[PDB]
């Protein structure tokens, strides 16, 4: 008990066609205000987590499981309440665009919430600005890069003021500068709004920066902890099939060269200073 916004409790889920559960007795919390990352391989139960947090997928035994978002228990009567609280940027940049233009696409959620139009104009302008899309305020998605359309998705998510933003493989199809753009922007949004980010990813750099990293293996929670705690455990992740971020790899290689560095070093800047201090 430490002020968690999301608490996944005893969730099992079998895709309807598939024979086996995609998630088995999975329980985890999300510390309010954190940026935690979910990572996993082949078992890819994380691909199921976002659509469960927000309600698109139900669990298997609603009597035994319970998801809770911002104090609201996810149920039949509260699905929409909860979706106001948990906003999701999704993987494919196109196919997330409803509107024929940027501004229309941001306006969609306000419309869904019956926001009086004079408010909407102000809101859509502010969001589209906050993502640096005012040059393309009236542009058609067929003329926008994937980096832009991920920004525009982010913007429409922003206009509804959610309590948690999930990036559900949101950088996975983007050019690396686009990955940094989208990551920086969601960091800026998180600071400027005191939000929580759930990142569902295979970008180990992305998860390297998370306050918390949960490891998912075959639909169960293999391990969980700060990146400085999780990513040094090279053997565990290698067996799951996961890699590790660049810094933890360079540290491990240096170890295979004989040079041993501590676990707490977890940063480009920290490491540079470490090797600096060794040469003097």
């Amino acid at each position, epitope marked *: 008990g430490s002020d968690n916004i999301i608490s996944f409790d005893h969730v099992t889920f079998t895709y309807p066609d598939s024979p086996r559960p995609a998630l088995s007795d999975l329980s985890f919390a999300i510390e309010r205000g954190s940026w935690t990352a979910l990572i996993g391989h082949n078992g890819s139960g994380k691909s199921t987590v976002s659509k469960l947090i927000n309600g698109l997928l139900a669990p298997d035994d609603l009597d035994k499981s319970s998801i809770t978002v911002d104090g609201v228990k996810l149920g039949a009567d509260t699905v929409w*309440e909860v979706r106001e*609280k948990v906003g999701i940027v999704f993987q494919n940049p196109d196919n997330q665009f409803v509107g024929a233009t940027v501004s229309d696409d941001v306006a969609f959620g*306000l419309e*869904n*919430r*019956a926001v009086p139009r*004079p*408010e909407m104009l102000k*809101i859509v302008a502010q969001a589209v600005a906050d993502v640096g899309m005012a040059d393309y305020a009236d542009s058609e998605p067929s003329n926008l890069s994937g980096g832009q359309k991920q920004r525009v998705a982010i913007a429409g998510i922003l206009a*509804v003021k959610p309590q948690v933003i999930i990036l559900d493989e949101s950088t996975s199809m983007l050019d690396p500068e686009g990955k940094e753009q989208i990551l920086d922007l969601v960091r800026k949004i998180k600071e400027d709004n005191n939000l929580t980010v759930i990142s569902i990813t295979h970008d180990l750099e992305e998860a390297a920066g998370a306050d918390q990293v949960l490891v998912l293996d075959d639909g169960q929670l293999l391990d969980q902890g700060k990146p400085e705690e999780i990513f040094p455990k090279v053997e565990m992740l290698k067996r799951i099939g996961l890699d590790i971020p660049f810094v933890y790899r360079l540290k491990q290689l240096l170890k295979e060269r004989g040079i041993v560095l501590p676990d707490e070093i977890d940063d480009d800047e920290k490491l540079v200073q470490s090797l600096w201090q060794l040469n003097s």
Partner: nanobody
Framework: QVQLVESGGGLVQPGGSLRLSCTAS????????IGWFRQAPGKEREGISC????????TYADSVKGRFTISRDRAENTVYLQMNSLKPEDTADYYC???????????????????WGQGTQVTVSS
């Protein structure tokens, strides 16, 4: 569209009760989720309660939970806050805030609300 007006604050004895009222004028409250907040003299502003544009969802802080009850009066374009079992600590300035971007829910946080009233002052002691 901000012209929010709190009312009904004043001095009341410990264990008594009183009902604050958050009214709009020039716009309709139903277009806005309404949150009640409360800033003590040396504290930070504290979200205490709130109601959704649907009017189906309500949130209370653990401080006021079970004593205060919020309500939308559609006919009267007001949202009422009903404070019972008032204790010395409840004494503060009370504010109502409005934001349109939620229909099905509401949150008790200072951040998301865009339009505020000027606050009515509630004092409980004897």
């Amino acid at each position: 569209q901000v012209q929010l007006v709190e009312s009904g604050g004043g001095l009341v004895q410990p264990g008594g009760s009183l009902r604050l009222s958050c009214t709009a004028s020039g716009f309709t409250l139903d277009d806005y989720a309404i949150g009640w907040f409360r800033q003590a003299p040396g504290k930070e502003r504290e979200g205490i309660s709130c109601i959704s544009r649907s009017g189906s969802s309500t949130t209370y802080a653990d401080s006021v939970k079970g004593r205060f009850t919020i309500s939308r009066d559609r006919a009267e374009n007001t949202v009422y806050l009903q404070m019972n079992s008032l204790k010395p600590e409840d004494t503060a300035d009370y504010y109502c805030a409005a934001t349109p971007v939620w229909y099905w829910s509401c949150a008790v946080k200072v951040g998301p609300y865009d339009y505020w009233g000027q606050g009515t002052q509630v004092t409980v002691s004897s």
